[PDB]
Design a protein around this ligand. Sequence first.
Ligand code: CB4
Length: 263
Amino acid sequence: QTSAVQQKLAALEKSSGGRLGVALIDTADNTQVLYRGDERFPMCSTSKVMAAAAVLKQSETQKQLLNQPVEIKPADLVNYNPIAEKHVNGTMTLAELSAAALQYSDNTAMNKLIAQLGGPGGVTAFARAIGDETFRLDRTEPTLNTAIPGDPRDTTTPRAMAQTLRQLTLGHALGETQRAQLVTWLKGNTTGAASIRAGLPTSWTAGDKTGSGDYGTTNDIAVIWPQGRAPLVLVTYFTQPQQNAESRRDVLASAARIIAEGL
Ligand SMILES: *[B]([O])([O])[C][N]C(=O)/C(=N\OC([C])([C])C([O])=O)C1=[C]SC([N])=N1
């Protein structure tokens, strides 16, 4: 079946010239709305939620892990390091790295999370441990953002990422204190007002993690507390046919608005 909402998303996609993937979970009734929900998309920085969550899981058995210092060296800097460059020849704690990765999309910070987990496969292993059979992280920053059409590296599906984000932020994949920490981090994101949240009333509370990469890849994953009802989880992924395509956060906002309309 094709619902009215799915028809509108396809219309949006046609006008956009790219490929759009959407997955909604409404936690009031657990119902789902998907558009290309089982197609793979490059995650880009939306993968940082899984990495941060994996380190939060490690911290459940190490009370001091989030305060553990990690050395930042000049050679560690990559393409986008707004927080880590302040700490070169110094240290950042794993909490500071997590916050920088999530709230500023610092890529050096992400590489330190990946290293703490033993490499990209450590992030994938955590995904599997919490029931996500789809997620895969294969590379570090910055090459995990190449976003080449047809490449399975560093991809997931909208369906899988919505389910995982629900389990991490509203369910019991993490301990209570760690879940709260992840939600606090996402709610303090600085990069998201033009993406999913631009399509929802600005008055609704939400947290999100954006992603950007080559092929004009423009992504967002969000947990949303709408006024008067149970939270939503919403994934919007978008990627374009040209390697040097421009960002299209407006397409994510438009997808979110269509979903909101549909409630
Ligand atoms: B993540 O997807 O937010 C990390 N993003 C990147 O590394 C890319 N751009 O990030 C900045 C510079 C902050 C931006 O302009 O979006 C990136 C990697 S490949 C590419 N074309 N853009």
